[PDB]
Amino acid sequence: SMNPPPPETSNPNKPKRQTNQLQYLLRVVLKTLWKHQFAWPFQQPVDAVKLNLPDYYKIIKTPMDMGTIKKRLENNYYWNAQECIQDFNTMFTNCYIYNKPGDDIVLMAEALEKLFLQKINELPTEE
Numbered sequence: 001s002m003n004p005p006p007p008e009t010s011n012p013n014k015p016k017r018q019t020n021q022l023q024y025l026l027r028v029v030l031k032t033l034w035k036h037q038f039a040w041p042f043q044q045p046v047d048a049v050k051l052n053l054p055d056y057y058k059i060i061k062t063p064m065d066m067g068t069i070k071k072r073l074e075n076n077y078y079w080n081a082q083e084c085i086q087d088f089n090t091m092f093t094n095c096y097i098y099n100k101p102g103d104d105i106v107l108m109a110e111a112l113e114k115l116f117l118q119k120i121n122e123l124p125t126e127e
């Protein structure tokens with residue numbers, strides 16, 4: 001069994017900025033989800049080897065996780081808030097695509113996604 005390389009968190013070629021919205025996505029959104037009792041399965045890329053999910057990276061071709069998002073935000077990797085919001089939405093969607101309703105991992109994704117939606121609802125206007 002083999003894991004793919006993780007998503008890119010560094011790329012000098014890539015245009016990037018700090019925006020007040022991306023600052024909010026780190027200080028408020030990432031921080032809120034990261035500290036949650038259900039955060040731990042999402043704090044690093046899915047280890048399909050250790051979890052014995054040999055089909056995971058046959059089904060999930062756009063993997064994403066909060067470990068990757070944390071590194072992208074800390075490295076100021078993003079151009080805009082929408083790129084980062086897409087990463088969160090990819091993470092949740094992947095969980096729902098691979099797993100089935102009522103699975104513990106899905107209940108955990110649903111709890112995190114509720115908070116995500118509550119926080120992004122108050123994403124500030126761009127400065």
Ligand SMILES: CC(=O)Nc1c(F)cc(C(=O)N[C@H]2CC[C@H](O)CC2)cc1O[C@@H](C)c1ccccc1
Binds near residue numbers: 041056094100104105
């Ligand atoms: C980020 C993510 O989603 N990870 C993750 C996953 F993709 C799949 C499974 C998993 O075992 N799915 C099975 C459900 C039942 C089906 O019949 C067969 C597949 C577990 C996962 O997380 C572990 C740490 C976990 C394990 C237990 C509780 C919470 C998290």
